Design a protein around this ligand. Sequence first.
Ligand SMILES: O=C(O)CNC(=O)C(=O)O
Ligand SMILES: [Mg+2]
Ligand code: NI
Ligand SMILES: [Zn+2]
Length: 331
Amino acid sequence: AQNPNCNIMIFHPTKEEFNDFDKYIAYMESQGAHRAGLAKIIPPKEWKARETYDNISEILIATPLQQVASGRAGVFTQYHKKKKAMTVGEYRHLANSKKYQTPPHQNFEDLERKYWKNRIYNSPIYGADISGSLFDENTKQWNLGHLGTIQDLLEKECGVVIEGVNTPYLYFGMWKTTFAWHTEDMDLYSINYLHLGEPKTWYVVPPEHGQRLERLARELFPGSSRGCGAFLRHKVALISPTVLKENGIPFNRITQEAGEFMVTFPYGYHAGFNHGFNCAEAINFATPRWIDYGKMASQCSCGEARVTFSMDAFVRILQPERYDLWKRGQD
Ligand SMILES: O=C(O)CNC(=O)C(=O)O
Ligand SMILES: [Mg+2]
Ligand code: NI
Ligand SMILES: [Zn+2]
């Protein structure tokens, strides 16, 4: 068995190997990359996502989200308070202000210490989930706006044509902006490209150990657990590496820098934080190996998780028993 310790693997494809996306994902899996739940892909030196980032300031962040924490430093939830619209140029200036900017630090480990010590005492503003792309249309390789769609994969594997679309999302971050512990919708893959700015630190639980994280979360967030049998789908709970280590939960960590891709694998729980002003692009995708994970994915039916239009068909075809209850949660 390849990668039996479930370490995060880092790949350096050549420009020739960067042509065929599906083939390279299957290669990384042949080497055991999925066992970690997360892999890093450093693009060939010849590749670029676009020519420059000099002209992005007029993108609108219609609904910036202020991430307000409750709890203790290592075990907290966050809720998202909606703020007034602002442009990316306005948000960059805000991220660089004395109130929000990255503090002085020695190295990524010192910054990680400061994040976990101090996160809860601040409320950073995240420009999340903005439909769009920063890949140039002429970028042919690993262009997250030109991937094969999940609907087409389901149709190829299973023979059933379904409605729905699959487009990328932009994320504009600042120091301390936080992504809570989750797997993807329908336990899909995700791919994330850090276009510019400061790093993103990731934490990940191997898929084979995801239920260990779920059991800890039910213990640590006991009210939320009674409210919903899949409350991590709400994407609000944070647990620190120290608390994970105290409780014996297997996990790994890695820092993504600008110019690098990350892939999350089916049922790989992940969480993390931004170091400073940055912009990332991400999308879900599927492969043949996902289908079995989609069939078994948990679902929130309490009404909190509320998701995209395209998840309807995935539930309806892969999980027909659950469909009725899940759709009640959506309406
Ligand atoms: O970058 C972020 O805020 C969160 N991204 C992801 O969870 C992802 O790409 O799967
Ligand atoms: Mg612009
Ligand atoms: Ni994710
Ligand atoms: Zn729920």
